[PDB]
Amino acid sequence: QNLKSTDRAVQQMLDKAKREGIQTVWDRYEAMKPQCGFGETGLCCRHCLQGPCRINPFGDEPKVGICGATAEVIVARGLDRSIAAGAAGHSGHAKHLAHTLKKAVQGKAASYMIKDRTKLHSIAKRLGIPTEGQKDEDIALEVAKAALADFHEKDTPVLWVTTVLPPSRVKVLSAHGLIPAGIDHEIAEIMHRTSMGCDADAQNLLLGGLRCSLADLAGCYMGTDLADILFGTPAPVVTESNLGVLKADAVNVAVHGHNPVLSDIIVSVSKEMENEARAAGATGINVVGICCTGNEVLMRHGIPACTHSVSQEMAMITGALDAMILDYQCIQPSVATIAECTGTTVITTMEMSKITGATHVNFAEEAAVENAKQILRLAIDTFKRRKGKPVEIPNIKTKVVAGFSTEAIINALSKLNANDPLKPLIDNVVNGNIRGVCLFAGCNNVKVPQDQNFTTIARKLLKQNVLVVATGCGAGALMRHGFMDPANVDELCGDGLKAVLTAIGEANGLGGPLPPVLHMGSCVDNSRAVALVAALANRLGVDLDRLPVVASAAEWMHEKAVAIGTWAVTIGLPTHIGVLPPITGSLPVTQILTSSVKDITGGYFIHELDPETAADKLLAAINERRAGLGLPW
Amino acid sequence: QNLKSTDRAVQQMLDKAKREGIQTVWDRYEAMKPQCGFGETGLCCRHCLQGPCRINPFGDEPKVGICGATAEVIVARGLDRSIAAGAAGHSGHAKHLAHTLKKAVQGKAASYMIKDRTKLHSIAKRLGIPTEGQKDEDIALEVAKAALADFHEKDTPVLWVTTVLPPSRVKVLSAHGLIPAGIDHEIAEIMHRTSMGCDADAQNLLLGGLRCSLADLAGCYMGTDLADILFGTPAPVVTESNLGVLKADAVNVAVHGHNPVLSDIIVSVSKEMENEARAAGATGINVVGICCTGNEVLMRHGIPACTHSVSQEMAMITGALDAMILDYQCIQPSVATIAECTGTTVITTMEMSKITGATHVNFAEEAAVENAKQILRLAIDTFKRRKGKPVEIPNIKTKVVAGFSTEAIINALSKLNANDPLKPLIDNVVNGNIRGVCLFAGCNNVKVPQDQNFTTIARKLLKQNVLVVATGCGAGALMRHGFMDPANVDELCGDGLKAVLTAIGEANGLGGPLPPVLHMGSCVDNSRAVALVAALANRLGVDLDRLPVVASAAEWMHEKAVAIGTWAVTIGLPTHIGVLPPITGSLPVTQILTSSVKDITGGYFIHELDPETAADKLLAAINERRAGLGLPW
Ligand code: SF4
Ligand code: SF4
Ligand code: FES
Ligand code: FES
Ligand SMILES: [Fe+3]
Ligand SMILES: [Fe+3]
């Protein structure tokens, strides 16, 4: 079972699932083997009814698609469509928040409101919306309107790209025609240009993909901006993670999916309705997080994280999960089937994301509180139905310190230098205490034993004094293995990095260091790491492709993460990926993405499946950046 | 070779290509066999890096995707993405025209202009834009702005759906939540909802697809509206088709692709520069059409149609095609490779549609005339390089009467009844002279011997007194086999239909009947057939799903045609398709699309590969509609 997951709590429930005959994602993966090699290499195309077409990676025919499409064209078209799908997912999430803010400040969704006035005002100034002399509800309405405007063509390009990156970076991107004109405009243009009998030039295709990946960055950043306005900018918090955060005695309610517009309300209302859970014989309502919406409520409210990504079914297998509350993205549809065996009430809430067999509760922002009550009452009723039934919650959990927004990181640094808060961090980069910065992002993937790449690469980089920040299921993987607990700084961190984490933590009145890894939030909160690295770049007067900053999507899965890794490359970062995407069937495409894209953006993909080697290659990329600045390494 | 194409001119060049060793689409198809059965049935998914996943249509594992996605979910997700890609293609075409009109009436593209004032004004009134008291350049600017606005969310739904369909049809669609909110908004929402771990309910998924197919209808209709404003509403014209329209002595220039913003300029300028072709020893500049942009210039200017779709390489094989001028969609990328052997200069002109090996001439509307000259001069130079070289143009051509816009059809009918022009057509429907109406649309497909379904179904329906209208490569197939020549009315048409075509033609001062099939234009001009059938529905006070009107995508290929067939079903038509899309791996999905969608929209797909049976099934659907009106059949 340790070949399936490195998580001991996950291993325990794989054993339960096996003896109870419940099929798991790993069983379904086993049943899928050997997987198709055409699809695995990218040498397959179904973009018209003359297909499916395939190309032998080596040997005799077929060598070309029926229409004449080459291996490099087919491979670039499929990758482009992946980026556009990811962009669409982050786009719909941000759009949802934009509509919610608009409804809130027009008196239509009274359950929502401007909770962060400081963020609202700083966003308006970033965008050049006037603050002085304007009411907050009118500033917010203007900000919401500008968010919605970035989805279509207009007189300006996408502001959630051009106002968030260093200006030298925007200039370099504009010179190559890479600045998105509108978020949904780029998505549609990708779908067009990759359809049959359109764009048939690998380089042209890939440049379109880089541009669309910046449409995804825009959606992430606007998702983060809007969620902070509506729900508060995260600040450091302490909580726990892994399955041991379930309580046999309480009504265990999982928020699962991505968008907090729903889950943030569930958190708030659950607190009020906890007298009503006691009436049914539970201690209360134990709200726990799964996947990114769990990260959202962990980052803002300290909701404990139950589990993540590939292992999400395992929360159900305990027998104690009374309800799983879904919006969209990364929900294994199997949870609807597994619920028949575990008793869990699975509830979908968004019109465009239903699962056959799951209870659907239409959720409307105008009636959010009533909807949350109806859903929490279904959870209460399910906990009743399992009173007396035996549960197996693995007694396994870790301590998690999280909530490291870019605002919170800068504020923490400000305690060392009040008027130049980035200077102490840069000072320790220059003197070697911080070797560089690595962002871990993305998913788990059934192809990789869960968390194995994340923890192995992280252990090695931390020893080498790398400041590690993490998001999404990368943060989930690290937090479930102890990397967000300050008690592990001595074991995990190098002396230089420990010095820095200790100085900052003690200067923030903690008596202890910062945790070994800084949790910066959900997948859209990859935008927070951009905001930080862009702030570092601007204080130093250099572009991102000169900073000792790298990224690792060490176990990635979703089209969203493909878009993120592409925009990490596009904004100039060396970007390690731990599962090969379907590109190896074209050497020219692989070469563009791993080498010659350096000449355009300064970033590049690092393909490396073995995580020890991956850590070496990431350190090498960090140290090459150090040298280009004339720094010791 | 007659197993490859029923076109005798195409057969002749297949023989030339074979002996010269030039590989063709049919050779590439042969080399692709046996094609993958997972993809053919739709039981394959690559929407995340845990894939590729497949499902055995029958038997043992794999039975489900790794994430738990069922066969019905995988099949519905892939179909949805096809509709969105088609919608994106018609969207980008319409968007292009919208930007051109805006530039034209703002003094930025002086090569363009309001050529059809009547169409401009009637569009403004359809949309409720004010005409009386307004300048034309200001009405047009308002119309262009409303076109661009329909791509994103706003206070109104997509007007190029809600103002073009019968109001009872809009009401039925709204009740099911099927009205698009914005064109690129629906495209992005499809891409989101079909990504991993989102929508996992076949019915929910398919309803999203119907809605996105109406976003495609909107793009088609707005493409037709804008092209008519800018370039003129088509009116009846006479010209020729097939390879025999090439002339060994002239500079033969093919316009190929979809968007006339480019090709309409090529037509105009080529006329001026024909003294300059004589200086190089050609009789002139023979502009000919391929695919839909050829239909556009055929419909408006009587440019002869060279060939279409699957057989487009064959124009090159003659040796006399000096240049092929491309914008996007349905261009086999093989033309760039074949040009090395035939001498043809292949020229791409749009930034997002390049082919490796082809000459790229950036085309800008602000400099359209200079660009057209540079391109026509390359054609002139290539004709020089082949003086003395021997050519093999098959001496095969047909007479084509075309240009039957809905305006032109109504005007022609008006000569029989000036104040109630639709009444004579309805009168002959009621009395049986016209059994019903069939639209042929879509592509050729290498899987079907070229034109075989189109001509066989058409021959049978015309004998049974069906009024046949046709667009795109369906019109191409019919026109290359003589169905647009009035001299064939006696052989092809039934006595009732002949009576009607004769009465209308003679009343329009022709001494002869209308041609056996009415050519209504390019693929986006499928919107013209909607406008006609909606006008018929409104005059009768019934919805489209009560009219004896059907459609046949008899040889379809492109994601665009998948979107068109879906919106034909969505607006209420029985819709025959001659190549199975990848859905047969899910009985529940096949059942929705072929039967139970009747209960939602009144339309339904008719899957039928054998064209004789297809004609029987189409007649049965027409006759069932007749009966529901209490009409004799
Ligand atoms: S687009 Fe070309 S390569 Fe793809 S399925 Fe169609 S014919 Fe084959
Ligand atoms: S989305 Fe599901 S079915 Fe598709 S490739 Fe990923 S795991 Fe497989
Ligand atoms: S041939 Fe297997 S992914 Fe298409
Ligand atoms: S298994 Fe062949 S299309 Fe994927
Ligand atoms: Fe996740
Ligand atoms: Fe065509």
Side-chain angles (χ1 to χ4, degrees):
Chain A
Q1 300 298 25
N2 50 81
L3 291 101
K4 294 183 171 109
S5 176
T6 71
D7 186 319
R8 263 177 182 170
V10 173
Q11 290 169 8
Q12 199 184 316
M13 314 279 87
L14 285 164
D15 285 327
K16 190 163 191 295
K18 178 170 166 181
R19 83 189 168 252
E20 287 178 3
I22 306 170
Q23 175 190 70
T24 78
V25 56
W26 291 273
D27 304 321
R28 293 195 294 280
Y29 176 47
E30 217 46 41
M32 198 58 63
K33 295 189 182 174
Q35 285 183 103
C36 181
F38 298 105
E40 184 52 63
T41 59
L43 296 176
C44 176
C45 177
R46 296 165 60 198
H47 289 198
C48 86
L49 301 185
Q50 298 189 133
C53 293
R54 74 196 179 287
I55 296 181
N56 289 330
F58 296 110
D60 297 341
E61 305 164 318
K63 267 166 163 323
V64 67
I66 287 166
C67 59
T70 59
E72 88 190 38
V73 169
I74 288 169
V75 161
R77 287 191 315 197
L79 180 69
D80 273 8
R81 278 187 174 186
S82 291
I83 293 161
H90 289 132
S91 149
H93 171 142
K95 191 182 294 188
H96 196 349
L97 285 164
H99 286 309
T100 301
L101 178 65
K102 186 135 152 289
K103 299 183 191 183
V105 303
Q106 288 186 330
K108 303 199 189 57
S111 299
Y112 305 85
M113 83 188 54
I114 298 171
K115 294 199 198 183
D116 205 310
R117 215 177 155 289
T118 308
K119 188 86 179 207
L120 175 61
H121 280 251
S122 64
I123 289 164
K125 330 222 208 83
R126 203 201 63 224
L127 296 164
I129 289 168
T131 50
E132 328 155 21
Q134 315 291 327
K135 183 142 91 103
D136 285 356
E137 305 78 62
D138 297 290
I139 292 158
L141 178 71
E142 280 319 295
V143 162
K145 282 177 177 188
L148 291 170
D150 261 5
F151 289 86
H152 55 78
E153 290 172 300
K154 52 172 168 33
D155 40 352
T156 62
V158 178
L159 296 187
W160 261 273
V161 178
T162 56
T163 74
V164 297
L165 289 179
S168 56
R169 173 46 53 165
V170 177
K171 195 209 298 179
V172 165
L173 295 173
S174 316
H176 293 284
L178 295 180
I179 298 285
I183 295 179
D184 293 352
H185 167 94
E186 295 306 325
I187 294 165
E189 192 173 74
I190 290 289
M191 287 321 285
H192 183 189
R193 84 186 302 160
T194 60
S195 66
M196 185 265 162
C198 301
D199 205 15
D201 182 77
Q203 165 93 306
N204 200 41
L205 280 158
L206 290 174
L207 292 183
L210 303 193
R211 174 161 71 254
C212 190
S213 80
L214 295 172
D216 178 89
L217 170 61
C220 291
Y221 210 118
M222 164 209 314
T224 302
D225 271 354
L226 297 177
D228 286 355
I229 290 170
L230 285 165
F231 305 118
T233 304
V237 288
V238 202
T239 182
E240 307 173 291
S241 72
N242 219 342
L243 295 182
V245 304
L246 295 158
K247 293 160 161 53
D249 273 14
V251 184
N252 299 279
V253 176
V255 296
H256 183 21
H258 279 70
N259 204 316
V261 58
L262 158 69
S263 71
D264 205 277
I265 301 304
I266 299 294
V267 162
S268 325
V269 166
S270 74
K271 293 175 176 182
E272 317 306 7
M273 309 185 65
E274 233 190 63
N275 256 305
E276 194 177 317
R278 273 180 224 110
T283 49
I285 307 180
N286 184 37
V287 170
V288 304
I290 300 175
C291 261
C292 269
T293 197
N295 277 327
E296 300 278 5
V297 290
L298 182 152
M299 282 273 311
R300 296 195 176 72
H301 307 308
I303 302 298
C306 175
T307 192
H308 302 92
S309 178
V310 69
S311 66
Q312 57 187 264
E313 307 165 305
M314 297 301 108
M316 285 168 108
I317 305 288
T318 63
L321 188 72
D322 300 301
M324 197 201 258
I325 312 187
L326 302 176
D327 47 63
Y328 42 67
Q329 300 175 14
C330 301
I331 301 142
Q332 292 181 24
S334 63
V335 304
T337 290
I338 284 179
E340 302 187 47
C341 301
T342 65
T344 299
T345 302
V346 173
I347 296 151
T348 57
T349 63
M350 305 297 333
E351 262 281 326
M352 32 69 63
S353 195
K354 295 178 185 179
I355 311 181
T356 307
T359 309
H360 187 77
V361 164
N362 188 306
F363 166 80
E365 296 65 36
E366 319 70 350
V369 168
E370 334 166 19
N371 295 159
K373 290 188 171 204
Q374 175 182 6
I375 297 167
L376 287 174
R377 284 209 244 271
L378 298 171
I380 287 164
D381 278 13
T382 296
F383 168 100
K384 274 206 280 173
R385 277 201 299 281
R386 76 165 169 82
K387 78 214 100 63
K389 194 161 162 59
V391 298
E392 187 188 328
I393 303 167
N395 188 46
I396 294 175
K397 50 185 189 156
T398 56
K399 185 200 180 167
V400 171
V401 181
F404 295 102
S405 62
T406 292
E407 294 76 0
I409 290 166
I410 287 182
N411 167 213
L413 286 166
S414 69
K415 309 295 169 187
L416 295 173
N417 178 337
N419 313 149
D420 199 358
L422 299 174
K423 188 168 150 50
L425 174 53
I426 295 152
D427 281 344
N428 284 289
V429 168
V430 173
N431 71 21
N433 282 353
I434 302 301
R435 185 174 297 263
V437 175
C438 177
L439 161 63
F440 285 106
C443 338
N444 302 119
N445 186 315
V446 82
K447 288 169 172 173
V448 172
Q450 175 183 24
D451 312 326
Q452 168 167 103
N453 293 346
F454 287 116
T455 59
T456 300
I457 303 162
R459 269 169 192 289
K460 212 254 173 63
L461 299 180
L462 288 164
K463 282 299 184 199
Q464 292 289 282
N465 301 300
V466 172
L467 180 66
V468 173
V469 299
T471 65
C473 293
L478 292 182
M479 95 175 66
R480 281 182 289 90
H481 291 265
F483 289 74
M484 281 58 162
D485 182 353
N488 294 307
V489 164
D490 278 280
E491 172 206 10
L492 291 180
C493 305
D495 291 322
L497 167 65
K498 170 166 60 213
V500 176
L501 295 174
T502 306
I504 300 164
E506 298 203 302
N508 286 257
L510 304 178
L514 287 164
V517 168
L518 300 187
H519 188 349
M520 304 171 70
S522 62
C523 197
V524 296
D525 292 351
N526 285 303
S527 63
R528 302 190 194 277
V530 178
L532 174 61
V533 150
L536 286 175
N538 289 331
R539 179 74 186 58
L540 274 164
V542 305
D543 201 356
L544 290 42
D545 57 353
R546 296 203 69 199
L547 291 182
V549 175
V550 292
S552 177
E555 301 173 19
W556 69 346
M557 176 282 264
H558 196 284
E559 288 164 317
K560 281 179 294 139
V562 173
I564 283 163
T566 309
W567 64 241
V569 163
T570 306
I571 68 177
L573 300 177
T575 307
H576 165 249
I577 60 198
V579 174
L580 280 169
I583 68 170
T584 61
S586 168
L587 178 68
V589 168
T590 296
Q591 281 179 355
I592 295 169
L593 297 172
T594 60
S595 169
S596 77
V597 68
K598 273 169 189 170
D599 296 332
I600 307 184
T601 73
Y604 53 99
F605 278 110
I606 301 161
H607 300 351
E608 184 46 62
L609 270 49
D610 173 355
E612 286 272 39
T613 310
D616 291 349
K617 285 167 151 173
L618 281 163
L619 286 157
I622 286 162
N623 289 342
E624 283 158 28
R625 292 276 166 107
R626 293 188 68 74
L629 293 176
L631 284 196
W633 50 289
Chain B
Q1 300 298 25
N2 50 81
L3 291 101
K4 294 183 171 109
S5 176
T6 71
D7 186 319
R8 263 177 182 170
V10 173
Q11 290 169 8
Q12 199 184 316
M13 314 279 87
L14 285 164
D15 285 327
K16 190 163 191 295
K18 178 170 166 181
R19 83 189 168 252
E20 287 178 3
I22 306 170
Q23 175 190 70
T24 78
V25 56
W26 291 273
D27 304 321
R28 293 195 294 280
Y29 176 47
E30 217 46 41
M32 198 58 63
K33 295 189 182 174
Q35 285 183 103
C36 181
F38 298 105
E40 184 52 63
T41 59
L43 296 176
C44 176
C45 177
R46 296 165 60 198
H47 289 198
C48 86
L49 301 185
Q50 298 189 133
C53 293
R54 74 196 179 287
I55 296 181
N56 289 330
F58 296 110
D60 297 341
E61 305 164 318
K63 267 166 163 323
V64 67
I66 287 166
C67 59
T70 59
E72 88 190 38
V73 169
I74 288 169
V75 161
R77 287 191 315 197
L79 180 69
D80 273 8
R81 278 187 174 186
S82 291
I83 293 161
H90 289 132
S91 149
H93 171 142
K95 191 182 294 188
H96 196 349
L97 285 164
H99 286 309
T100 301
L101 178 65
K102 186 135 152 289
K103 299 183 191 183
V105 303
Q106 288 186 330
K108 303 199 189 57
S111 299
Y112 305 85
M113 83 188 54
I114 298 171
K115 294 199 198 183
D116 205 310
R117 215 177 155 289
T118 308
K119 188 86 179 207
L120 175 61
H121 280 251
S122 64
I123 289 164
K125 330 222 208 83
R126 203 201 63 224
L127 296 164
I129 289 168
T131 50
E132 328 155 21
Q134 315 291 327
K135 183 142 91 103
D136 285 356
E137 305 78 62
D138 297 290
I139 292 158
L141 178 71
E142 280 319 295
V143 162
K145 282 177 177 188
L148 291 170
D150 261 5
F151 289 86
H152 55 78
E153 290 172 300
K154 52 172 168 33
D155 40 352
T156 62
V158 178
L159 296 187
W160 261 273
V161 178
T162 56
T163 74
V164 297
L165 289 179
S168 56
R169 173 46 53 165
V170 177
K171 195 209 298 179
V172 165
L173 295 173
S174 316
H176 293 284
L178 295 180
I179 298 285
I183 295 179
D184 293 352
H185 167 94
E186 295 306 325
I187 294 165
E189 192 173 74
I190 290 289
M191 287 321 285
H192 183 189
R193 84 186 302 160
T194 60
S195 66
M196 185 265 162
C198 301
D199 205 15
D201 181 77
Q203 165 93 306
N204 200 41
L205 280 158
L206 290 174
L207 292 183
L210 303 193
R211 174 161 71 254
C212 190
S213 80
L214 295 172
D216 178 89
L217 170 61
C220 291
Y221 210 118
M222 164 209 314
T224 302
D225 271 354
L226 297 177
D228 286 355
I229 290 170
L230 285 165
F231 305 118
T233 304
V237 288
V238 202
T239 182
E240 307 173 291
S241 72
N242 219 342
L243 295 182
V245 304
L246 295 158
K247 293 160 161 53
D249 273 14
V251 184
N252 299 279
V253 176
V255 296
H256 183 21
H258 279 70
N259 204 316
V261 58
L262 158 69
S263 71
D264 205 277
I265 301 304
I266 299 294
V267 162
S268 325
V269 166
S270 74
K271 293 175 176 182
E272 317 306 7
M273 309 185 65
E274 233 190 63
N275 256 305
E276 194 177 317
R278 273 180 224 110
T283 49
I285 307 180
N286 184 37
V287 170
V288 304
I290 300 175
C291 261
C292 269
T293 197
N295 277 327
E296 300 278 5
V297 290
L298 182 152
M299 282 273 311
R300 296 195 176 72
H301 307 308
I303 302 298
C306 175
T307 192
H308 302 92
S309 178
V310 69
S311 66
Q312 57 187 264
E313 307 165 305
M314 297 301 108
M316 285 168 108
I317 305 288
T318 63
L321 188 72
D322 300 301
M324 197 201 258
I325 312 187
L326 302 176
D327 47 63
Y328 42 67
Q329 300 175 14
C330 301
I331 301 142
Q332 292 181 24
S334 63
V335 304
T337 290
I338 284 179
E340 302 187 47
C341 301
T342 65
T344 299
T345 302
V346 173
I347 296 151
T348 57
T349 63
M350 305 297 333
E351 262 281 326
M352 32 69 63
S353 195
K354 295 178 185 179
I355 311 181
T356 307
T359 309
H360 187 77
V361 164
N362 188 306
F363 166 80
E365 296 65 36
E366 319 70 350
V369 168
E370 334 166 19
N371 295 159
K373 290 188 171 204
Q374 175 182 6
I375 297 167
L376 287 174
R377 284 209 244 271
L378 298 171
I380 287 164
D381 278 13
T382 296
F383 168 100
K384 274 206 280 173
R385 277 201 299 281
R386 76 165 169 82
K387 78 214 100 63
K389 194 161 162 59
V391 298
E392 187 188 328
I393 303 167
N395 188 46
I396 294 175
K397 50 185 189 156
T398 56
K399 185 200 180 167
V400 171
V401 181
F404 295 102
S405 62
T406 292
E407 294 76 0
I409 290 166
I410 287 182
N411 167 213
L413 286 166
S414 69
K415 309 295 169 187
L416 295 173
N417 178 337
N419 313 149
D420 199 358
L422 299 174
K423 188 168 150 50
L425 174 53
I426 295 152
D427 281 344
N428 284 289
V429 168
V430 173
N431 71 21
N433 282 353
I434 302 301
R435 185 174 297 263
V437 175
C438 177
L439 161 63
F440 285 106
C443 338
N444 302 119
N445 186 315
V446 82
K447 288 169 172 173
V448 172
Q450 175 183 24
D451 312 326
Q452 168 167 103
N453 293 346
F454 287 116
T455 59
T456 300
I457 303 162
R459 269 169 192 289
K460 212 254 173 63
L461 299 180
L462 288 164
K463 282 299 184 199
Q464 292 289 282
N465 301 300
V466 172
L467 180 66
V468 173
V469 299
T471 65
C473 293
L478 292 182
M479 95 175 66
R480 281 182 289 90
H481 291 265
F483 289 74
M484 281 58 162
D485 182 353
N488 294 307
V489 164
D490 278 280
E491 172 206 10
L492 291 180
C493 305
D495 291 322
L497 167 65
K498 170 166 60 213
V500 176
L501 295 174
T502 306
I504 300 164
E506 298 203 302
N508 286 257
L510 304 178
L514 287 164
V517 168
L518 300 187
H519 188 349
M520 304 171 70
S522 62
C523 197
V524 296
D525 292 351
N526 285 303
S527 63
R528 302 190 194 277
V530 178
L532 174 61
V533 150
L536 286 175
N538 290 331
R539 179 74 186 58
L540 274 164
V542 305
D543 201 356
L544 290 42
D545 57 353
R546 296 203 69 199
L547 291 182
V549 175
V550 292
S552 177
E555 301 173 19
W556 69 346
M557 176 282 264
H558 196 284
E559 288 164 317
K560 281 179 294 139
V562 173
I564 283 163
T566 309
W567 64 241
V569 163
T570 306
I571 68 177
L573 300 177
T575 307
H576 165 249
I577 60 198
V579 174
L580 280 169
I583 68 170
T584 61
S586 168
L587 178 68
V589 168
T590 296
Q591 281 179 355
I592 295 169
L593 297 172
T594 60
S595 169
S596 77
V597 68
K598 273 169 189 170
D599 296 332
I600 307 184
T601 73
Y604 53 99
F605 278 110
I606 301 161
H607 300 351
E608 184 46 62
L609 270 49
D610 173 355
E612 286 272 39
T613 310
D616 291 349
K617 285 167 151 173
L618 281 163
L619 286 157
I622 286 162
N623 289 342
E624 283 158 28
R625 292 276 166 107
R626 293 188 68 74
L629 293 176
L631 284 196
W633 50 289

